[PDB]
Amino acid sequence: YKTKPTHGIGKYKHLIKAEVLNIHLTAYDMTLAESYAQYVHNLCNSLSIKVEESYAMPTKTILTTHERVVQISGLSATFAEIFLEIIQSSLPEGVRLSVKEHTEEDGRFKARPELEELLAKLK
Amino acid sequence: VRREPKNLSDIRGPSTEATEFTEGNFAILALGGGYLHWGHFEMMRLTINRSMDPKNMFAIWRVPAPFKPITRKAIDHYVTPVKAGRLVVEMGGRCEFEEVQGFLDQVAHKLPFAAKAVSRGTLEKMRKDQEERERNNQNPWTFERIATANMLGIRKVLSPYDLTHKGKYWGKFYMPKRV
Amino acid sequence: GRRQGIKKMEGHYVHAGNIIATQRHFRWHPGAHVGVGKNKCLYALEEGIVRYTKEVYVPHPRNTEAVDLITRLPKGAVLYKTFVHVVPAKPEGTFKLVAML
Amino acid sequence: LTYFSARKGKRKTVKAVIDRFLRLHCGLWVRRKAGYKKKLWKKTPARKKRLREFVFCNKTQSKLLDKMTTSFWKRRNWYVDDPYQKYHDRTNLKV
Amino acid sequence: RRTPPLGPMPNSDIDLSNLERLEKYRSFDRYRRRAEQEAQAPHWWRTYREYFGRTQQLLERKQAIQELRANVEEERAARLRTASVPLDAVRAEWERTCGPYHKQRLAEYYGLYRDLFHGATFVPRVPLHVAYAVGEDDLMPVYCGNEVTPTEAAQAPEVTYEAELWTLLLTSLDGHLLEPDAEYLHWLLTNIPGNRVAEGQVTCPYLPPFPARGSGIHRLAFLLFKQDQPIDFSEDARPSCYQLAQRTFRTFDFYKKHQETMTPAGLSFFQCRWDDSVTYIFHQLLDMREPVFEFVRPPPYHPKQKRFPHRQPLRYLDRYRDSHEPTYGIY
Amino acid sequence: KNILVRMVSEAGTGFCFNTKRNRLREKLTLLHYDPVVKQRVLFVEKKKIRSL
Amino acid sequence: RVTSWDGRKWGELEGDTYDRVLVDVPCTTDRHSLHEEENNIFKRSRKKERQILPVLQVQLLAAGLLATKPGGHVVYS
Amino acid sequence: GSKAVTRHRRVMHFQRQKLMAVTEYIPPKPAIHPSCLP
RNA sequence: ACCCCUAUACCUUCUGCAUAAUGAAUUAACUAGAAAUAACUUUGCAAGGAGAGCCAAAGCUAAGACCCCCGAAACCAGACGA
RNA sequence: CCGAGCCUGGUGAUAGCUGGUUGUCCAAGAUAGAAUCUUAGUUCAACUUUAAAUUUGCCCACAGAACCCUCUAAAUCCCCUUGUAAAUUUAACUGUUAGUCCAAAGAGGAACAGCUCUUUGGACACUAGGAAAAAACCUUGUAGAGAGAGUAAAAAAUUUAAC
RNA sequence: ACCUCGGAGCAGAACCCAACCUCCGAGCAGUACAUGCUAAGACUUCACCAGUCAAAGCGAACCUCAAUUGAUCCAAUAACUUGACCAACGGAACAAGUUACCCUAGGGAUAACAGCGCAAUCCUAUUCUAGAGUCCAUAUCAACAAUAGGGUUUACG
Ligand SMILES: C[S@@+](CC[C@H](N)C(=O)[O-])C[C@H]1O[C@@H](n2cnc3c(N)ncnc32)[C@H](O)[C@@H]1O
Ligand SMILES: [Mg+2]
Ligand SMILES: [Mg+2]
Ligand SMILES: [Mg+2]
Ligand SMILES: [Mg+2]
Ligand SMILES: [Mg+2]
Ligand SMILES: [Mg+2]
Ligand SMILES: [Mg+2]
Ligand SMILES: [Mg+2]
Ligand SMILES: [Mg+2]
Ligand SMILES: [Mg+2]
Ligand SMILES: [Mg+2]
Ligand SMILES: [Mg+2]
Ligand SMILES: [Mg+2]
Ligand SMILES: [Mg+2]
Ligand SMILES: [Mg+2]
Ligand SMILES: [Mg+2]
């Protein structure tokens, strides 16, 4: 109750909120690429580096090579030093290491729970 | 696109916003509460620009662009609510008070609410004299003591806001002589 | 309106089955000796005295909608809910001599 | 209702009252719930039971019913095996 | 109107501008643990709790643990999860170590300390054993809080422990009839010559537990005392069968008189209900008729009866009816 | 859309109850408690009472 | 996902999110109007609706063209 | 009735006006005027 | 006696009404609250009361005490009228 | 005196509509709402009165009564103490419920008109004094005689341009 | 265009309460088939009718949903049960126009004129100096504004 000194003890939603690099890891072998992707992701989790997605686009038509990508964000310029050095050293077998960026031309399907407050703030 | 019910509470009470001198010596202090039309602003820009050269002296809009809607027998136009105490227009540069006061107060005359062109020194001066007057008073009885104590049952007549208002505000009107 | 509110205030004596509160959503949560109905209506399971306290909330593991909220909550944080309690007044029964046999 | 009959000059009972209500000798009146036979498919079982029960009437309803009915209906009846025999008298009633 | 908080409000300190950097309770169980921790912490606001109120030992241990895990055959059991522990062996040497410490809790849970000695707890160091002989072949063990019928407990039990004088005591805490607080004294032995029990003097002869019918479960405790020097006990105990009003005493008042002389060492307590044996105790040993007790319940609540009980089922009238048989007045 | 239909029991004969079904659905055979026999028994359709 | 909101808001709610869009705007319902009596769009009391009918159509279409991906396909019916 | 905020100066309740009369500022005047003093 | 001072006729329908609106020239005569259930009050008798019938788980018998005046346009039946 | 003649009778037609209603004296005594072929009316409730039975009532201190919305005021509920004398229940009837103005919080969309509507409170259908006469502003209530006395509210202030 | 029920704008913290108006929905659907029987004590849309929660007990098993609805009589049925856009939604078993040929009882002139209130509209004067006046603010005009007064118009009340 408002006047009582216990007020707003039930407040919860203030603690939450209701309101970029891409790494290529292509290999011919399909037993190798995902393993190293796993490893990089684990390194990211440990050092508090935000990850978006690990997307995979289909194998090239025939001979056949498939691409594994990891999205990373929150990396500082200074911290990049340490990070990139390790991911270069850990390279398993002639895997093309790329660092790609969103070029403002690379929209998401919003969930029903997310849409209601979005609508509320829209109007 | 939303219509607003007319909340006259905005004009009531002292201005707590844009009451600070910012990179400028001279400003027009509002002594009352009113809504500014676009016509007012048109006059503002015209007069100030034609008076003094912008290279030597600079003028600053310290008031937001109109956004409060007005409903008329549907929304027709937009207005800006201003409470008493807001510096509406700031002016700075290598200049003197004597030479600016003329056009500045002339521009302030056309304002719908009461207003005064003031320097930094003059504004702070009047703040000082007012707060000296309140401690200098020879009347045992202030509005403050009576209102808060509920002395004569005066709260029956008074409003809840009056306690905050110290009796210095009555509608859109600010009384500086009141202590 | 729906006439929903607190029926029995703090330190009120309440017989078993009485309504403590009615609510559209879960404003007050059932505590000790307090049952909740189909319509979230709080009633006294025992005769006694009503108390209102703040207690730390742990939802049922199966109840995903609240569990997920807990998961998103940062470390060190605890949800508090208001809980209503009936402190029973009279002990369950007494032992009495019937006969010397 | 008819205060004075044209044939005998005495009060008359409203027969609408007699085929809906049971009056107990003590002064209470018993009714059934309205719509207890109506649309039972849509009603909930708890609702259904609340409907089947025979209820009492408040003071004003009871007063109105007594005015609408003659003294004959208020006498004491010693029926053989009426299922309402016990309810005719009160027990442990202080005001 | 607002009133400032009297104490540190929860979640106030831990908040930050950014949340993305912070670790969340990824697990349900994580939060659960923290919530439990919060329940123990005292709070300024109203809480449910308010109203519902040497060095070489380590060296040997590490050596023995290293020796145990050394054998490959031992570890072969655990990985196949077809592994066992000697239950008896664990029990045997637990009593030496963590026996008394656990036993303290049970005594305070059953409220022995609060009832016997007004909350004056002690750790029961000596591993006391009591056995009750049933026939010739088997004897019932008395643990802490165990259930034993007074049929079995009809004669003097066999008590054994490591010892170097002593005083042995048996009390029925809740057994008493005439007074609430008071207790009966079953059999008292003083100036016990160590391990040997029989040679010590018999102050009070053995009496079996006698809990009345429907009086529920009765707890009976053995108390042992470390007697440094012998004492003459002029307590007016008169061996004969007995008269109950002489068996009544207070353990607290008894120990008060002899605080400095002796100190407790071990406890063992058993619970019991009524049995057919108890009947013979009143009849033979006491020469009195058996008291029987019932658990009754308080009368049901009904609101004050109204003259016009509006929108009530017809059965409202039957709530305030005392008899079920028809009545006729003057008729 | 739905229709109300009457359900009678094979066993404990002389008891019936009412239920909803879609018109498009197959003829309804059900299991329900009969207090005549004080047992859970099979029930079968006889007729449609009304359309709802 | 089934939602019951104004279709016009979608343009500013979600953008560049769909590769395929189908826009079935409210029309005069020619066959339906000729046959159905009740709730007819042509009922003379509801004349006002028809005056604000054409603009609405544009609005709804536009919302689709704002929500579609670059190179995304919208069909209007 | 009328709104609390008006374009013109609203007429007060008499009681309130009597209050305004009583709680007016009084300036202190010295026994000897300061300008006349050296 | 007047002069002095104080004093916004009555009824009725409206929240105010001074006054606004109906009603009154004045005198005499005439001109408008009729009853039950149930309660209360005071008696007689009392597990019974009542001068058949009826009521009764202190009731029953008796008494006392409660329910206005004037006014339409109409509708129908039978006579009378060119 | 014919959109259906006149007379007698039914007939004291019916009228939620208008008008009227007859000795003296004293006492208690006002504006929650609901349904209604209903808002010119009834019925129920609320208030009101009388009689009866019995025990608490009013004022109240601590403790207590929500999150969400992105932000919250005068306050309100509950309530021992206390100061007080009323309250609930039972029996029996009537009658009343179209208000207006002022202060405050608001919304109507003219910063709005003794203009409309919701809430809190005051006043008016009861006496008296004062503001010019004066429903609503201020002072004041329990009744008679007096050629005694003390008081309450209670009478607007203001005067101006040289250099 | 409406008449019943539930929301959204108004609702600040027990209950109730932003009229009128402007808008959004409801006249169900899905899942069980113990949506069995019985019974302490309570809540309630300001009456009544209706509506709502529920301990314990007898017998078994190891509901979602904001509204989603309809009295009596009567009719159908062996019984159990069923029946309305009675939506004018507390529901008359079943009935439309026109009257300036009109009548009676009344209320007002809550429709208009007459009389009143505000002054949105309109009228007038001042205050500021843009800009005209082939130079020149104030011979005479006059921009964007502010400040006053009257009650002639047009609306509002
Ligand atoms: C013409 S129907 C669509 C055709 C039909 N669903 C089909 O696939 O054949 C369009 C519907 O859109 C609805 N609608 C109206 N306003 C809308 C809006 N602003 N946004 C989306 N739908 C709207 C109308 O109710 C209308 O029935
Ligand atoms: Mg009248
Ligand atoms: Mg007149
Ligand atoms: Mg002729
Ligand atoms: Mg009427
Ligand atoms: Mg009086
Ligand atoms: Mg009604
Ligand atoms: Mg009707
Ligand atoms: Mg009518
Ligand atoms: Mg109290
Ligand atoms: Mg009126
Ligand atoms: Mg709303
Ligand atoms: Mg109610
Ligand atoms: Mg309500
Ligand atoms: Mg049960
Ligand atoms: Mg209706
Ligand atoms: Mg003509």
Ordered DSSP codes for D24-54? -TTS-EEEPPTTSSS-TTTS-HHHHHHHHS-
Backbone φ and ψ for A108, nearest 5 degrees, come out as -140, 155
d(CA G26, CA G57): 7
DSSP state of E3: -
- Tokens 């040993």 correspond to E285
SS3 of B95, please?
Answer: coil
| 8 Å CB contact of G9 and A107 | no
**Given the DSSP bridges, would you call strands C94-100 and C34-36 parallel, antiparallel or unpaired?**
unpaired
Question: CB of residue B3 closer than 7 A to nucleic acid strand J?
Answer: yes
Our measurement of CA A35 to C1' K77, in angstroms, reads: 77
CB E327 within 8 Å of CB D89: yes
Our measurement of CA H3 to C1' J115, in angstroms, reads: 12
Residue A45: inside a domain, yes or no? yes
Which ranges of chain H would DSSP assign to H, the alpha helix?
14-22
Q: After which residues is chain B broken (C to N over 2.5 A)?
A: 73
Q: What is the 3-state secondary structure (H, E, C) of E195-235?
A: CCCCCCEECCCCCCCCCCECCCCEEEEEEEEEECCCCCCCC
Our measurement of CA B39 to C1' J108, in angstroms, reads: 29
d(CA F6, CA F46): 6
The CATH code for residues E103-285 is 3.90.280.10
* Geometric angle at alpha carbon F42, from F37 and F48, rounded to 5°: 115
Cα-to-chain-centroid distance, residue D2: 20
Q: How many CA atoms lie less than 13 Å away from E100 in the CB half-sphere? A: 14
| Method for this entry | cryo-EM
Could you report how far apart the first and last alpha carbons of chain H are, in Å?
59
Q: Which residues pair with G40 in a beta bridge?
A: none
Structure-block tokens of residue E266: 């071990």
Q: Which residues, in sequence order, are CB contacts of E62 under 8 Å at separation 6+?
A: none
CB G23 within 8 Å of CB G74: yes
Resolution in A: 3.1
Count of beta carbons in the 10 Å neighbourhood of residue B80: 19
Residue A9: inside a domain, yes or no? yes
Put simply, whether A121 touches G (Cβ < 8 Å) is no
Contact residues on chain E for D57, CB-CB shorter than 8 A: 308, 310
CB A51 within 8 Å of CB A71: yes
- Where b means 16+ CB within 10 Å and e means fewer, D35-64 reads eeeeeeeeeeeeeeeebeeebbbeeeebee
- Where b means 16+ CB within 10 Å and e means fewer, E194-209 reads eeebeebeebbeebbb
| 8 Å CB contact of E21 and A3 | no
Q: Which residues pair with D95 in a beta bridge?
A: none
F38 class by beta-carbon count within 10 Å (0-12 exposed, 13-18 middle, 19+ buried)? exposed
D29 Cα: distance to centroid of ligand 4 (angstroms): 79
Q: CA A6 → CA A2, C28, C54, D6, E49, distances in Å?
A: 8, 15, 9, 78, 17
Question: CB of residue A123 closer than 7 A to nucleic acid strand J?
Answer: no
SS3 of F30, please?
Answer: strand
Domain with B118, as residue range(s), is 1-179
d(CA B173, CA B114): 9
E24-33 CB contacts, 8 Å cutoff, 24+ apart: E24/C71, E24/C72, E24/C73, E24/C74, E24/C75, E25/C70, E25/C71, E25/C73, E25/C74, E25/C75, E25/C77, E26/C71, E27/C71, E28/C61, E28/C67, E28/C70, E28/C71, E30/C75, E31/C58, E31/C70, E31/C71, E31/C73, E31/C78, E32/C58
Distance from CA of C44 to the nearest CA of A (A): 22
Q: H or E stretch including E63?
A: helix E55-68
- Give the strand order in the sheet containing E129-134: E138-142, E129-134, E158-160
Question: For chain I, which bases have at least one atom within 7 A of a protein Cβ?
Answer: 35-38, 47, 54-58, 67
Residue A68: inside a domain, yes or no? yes
* Closest listed residue to residue E286, CA positions, set E246, E241, E247: E241
C10 Cα: distance to centroid of ligand 10 (angstroms): 14
Q: Which residues, in sequence order, are CB contacts of C5 under 8 Å at separation 6+?
A: C21, C22
Our measurement of CA D93 to C1' I54, in angstroms, reads: 29
Q: H or E stretch including C91?
A: none
What does the domain layout of chain C look like in residue ranges?
1-101
D44 Cα: distance to centroid of ligand 15 (angstroms): 19
Angle, in degrees to the nearest 10, between helices E99-109 and E87-97: 80
**Could you tell me which CATH class the domain C1-101 is placed in?**
mainly beta
Put simply, whether E11 touches A (Cβ < 8 Å) is yes
Q: H or E stretch including A60?
A: none
Q: What is the 3-state secondary structure (H, E, C) of E242-309?
A: CCHHHCEECHHHHHHHCCCCEEEEEEEEEEECCCHHHHHHHHHHHCCCCEEEEEECCCCCCCCCCCCC
Q: Which residues pair with E295 in a beta bridge?
A: C95
A109 Cα: distance to centroid of ligand 6 (angstroms): 80
Nearest CA to ligand 1 atom 14: G26
* Closest listed residue to residue E132, CA positions, set E154, E161, E108: E154
Cα-to-chain-centroid distance, residue E2: 49
Number of H helices, E strands in chain C: 1, 8
- Sign, Cα dihedral of E138, E143, E148, E150: positive
Interface of E with D in 116-145 (CB under 8 A): none
| 8 Å CB contact of C97 and E10 | no
Which atom number of ligand 1 is nearest to the Cα of residue G7?
A: 20
CB H19 within 8 Å of CB B151: no
Which ranges of G7-52 would DSSP assign to H, the alpha helix?
10-13, 30-35, 47-51
G77 class by beta-carbon count within 10 Å (0-12 exposed, 13-18 middle, 19+ buried)? exposed
Backbone φ and ψ for A109, nearest 5 degrees, come out as -80, 105
Residue A117: inside a domain, yes or no? no
The domain that holds F25 is classified in CATH as 2.20.28.120
Number of H helices, E strands in chain H: 1, 0
Q: CA A82 → CA A75, A77, A85, C84, distances in Å?
A: 11, 10, 5, 55
User: Number of structural domains, chain F?
Assistant: 1
Q: How many CA atoms lie less than 13 Å away from A82 in the CB half-sphere? A: 8
Q: After which residues is chain H broken (C to N over 2.5 A)?
A: none
Structure-block tokens of residue D73: 């209906």
Structure-block tokens of residue H19: 């209050």
User: Number of structural domains, chain B?
Assistant: 1
**Given the DSSP bridges, would you call strands F2-9 and E218-227 parallel, antiparallel or unpaired?**
unpaired
Domain with A5, as residue range(s), is 1-103
* Closest listed residue to residue C64, CA positions, set A117, A116, A113, A18: A113
DSSP state of B46: H
- What is the amino acid identity at position B72? R
Structure-block tokens of residue D52: 């089947």
Distance from CA of E3 to the nearest CA of A (A): 5
CB C32 within 8 Å of CB C20: no
* Closest listed residue to residue A4, CA positions, set E6, B160, C49, C28: E6
CB C22 within 8 Å of CB C6: no
